[PDB]
Design a protein around this ligand. Structure first.
Ligand code: CL
Ligand code: MN
Length: 342
């Protein structure tokens, strides 16, 4: 049922690229999502990442819980810590943010959220880094095609995503263990572009655009999308399919396009067995600001580093990362980094 596209290796701006980008936009506007074909290498790397994830999740909780940092939000999140619309969600998560050594100038300077990933081991590290390198190449192709499909300069989005704050959430959902099967409630993702991969089990549902339906701007206080539409059709089951990733827009793409793209609502149902998946965020630079593309007189901006830092401080208010931001007043660095820019 979902539409599938094959991306060119290089996006150059030829008229065929523009046609493809238009078709990607149309698929998002119709279905909220599409598939992209993976080649043998992309597929191999995806499967290796899922295998590493499964092995890590079998480690004892005492070890998993030690994979945390007070410099970066990368690392482990136990089941039941994340909350959607007031209700705790079920997956355990390993988050991979930009892996910066303590010698990096941003880590030395104490920028919030910047530091080395607390990897469980080097084998897991290599599997996830190799996968994320491929995901990033796809993210850049997608963003060039999306700019072209809107008749924008080809580098409109990729100028923002140079050294972007790309990150991945590596998920394990438990089997169902009672009448409850809400693995994650309905929500929209805070990022720019989401590339999702899953194993063969099944559980992701997405909501297409619906004519006449009011959608909230989830980047605004007071317009949370959490829980909305959860018990009303339409919800499309994202059938596990060999040889594809799926792609949907996040909140920052909804903001930049003024709602011509909508951030795709989605939710996860627990299956009768455990399920592994990955959600990759292809993001602006920490220092970049998103802006409305089609409303030149609009003053509103989303500063990405501020957006991310505030999101994760709210997600994980007692994590040692959040404690150190507060103890050392690391949010002051964000204020400073804006000072002499246009
Ligand atoms: Cl998922
Ligand atoms: Mn999500």
């Amino acid at each position: 049922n979902l539409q599938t596209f094959e991306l060119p290796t290089e996006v150059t701006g030829c008229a065929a690229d523009i046609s493809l980008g238009r078709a990607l936009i149309q698929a998002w506007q119709k279905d909220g999502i599409f598939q992209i074909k993976t080649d043998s290498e992309q597929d191999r790397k995806t499967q290796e990442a899922m295998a590493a994830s499964k092995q890590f999740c079998k480690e004892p909780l005492t070890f998993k819980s030690s994979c945390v940092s007070d410099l970066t939000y990368s690392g482990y999140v136990a089941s039941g810590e994340e909350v959607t619309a007031g209700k705790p969600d079920f997956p355990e998560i390993f988050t991979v943010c930009k892996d910066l050594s303590v010698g990096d100038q941003r880590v030395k300077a104490g920028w919030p959220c910047h530091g080395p990933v607390p990897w469980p081991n080097n084998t897991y590290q290599k599997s996830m880094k190799t996968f994320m390198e491929e995901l990033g190449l796809a993210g850049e192709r997608l963003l060039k095609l999306t700019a072209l499909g809107f008749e924008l300069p080809i580098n409109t989005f990729t100028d923002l995503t140079r050294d972007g704050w790309h990150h991945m959430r590596v998920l394990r959902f438990p089997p169902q263990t009672s009448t409850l099967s809400r693995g994650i409630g309905a929500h929209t993702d805070y990022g720019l572009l989401v590339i999702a991969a899953q194993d063969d089990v099944g559980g992701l549902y997405i909501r297409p655009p619906v004519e006449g339906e009011k959608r909230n701007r989830n980047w605004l206080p007071g317009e949370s999308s959490a829980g909305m539409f959860e018990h009303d059709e339409p919800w499309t089951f994202v059938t596990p399919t060999p040889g594809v990733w799926t792609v949907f827009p996040g909140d920052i793409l909804q903001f930049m396009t003024g709602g011509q793209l909508l951030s795709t609502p989605h939710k996860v149902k627990l299956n009768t067995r455990e399920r592994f998946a990955c959600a990759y965020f292809h993001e602006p630079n920490f220092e970049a600001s998103a802006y409305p593309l089609f409303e030149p007189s609009a003053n509103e901006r989303i500063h990405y580093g501020e957006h991310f830092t505030n999101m994760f401080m709210r997600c994980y208010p007692d994590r040692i990362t959040t404690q150190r931001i507060n103890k050392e007043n690391r949010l002051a660095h964000l204020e400073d980094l804006k000072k002499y820019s246009d």
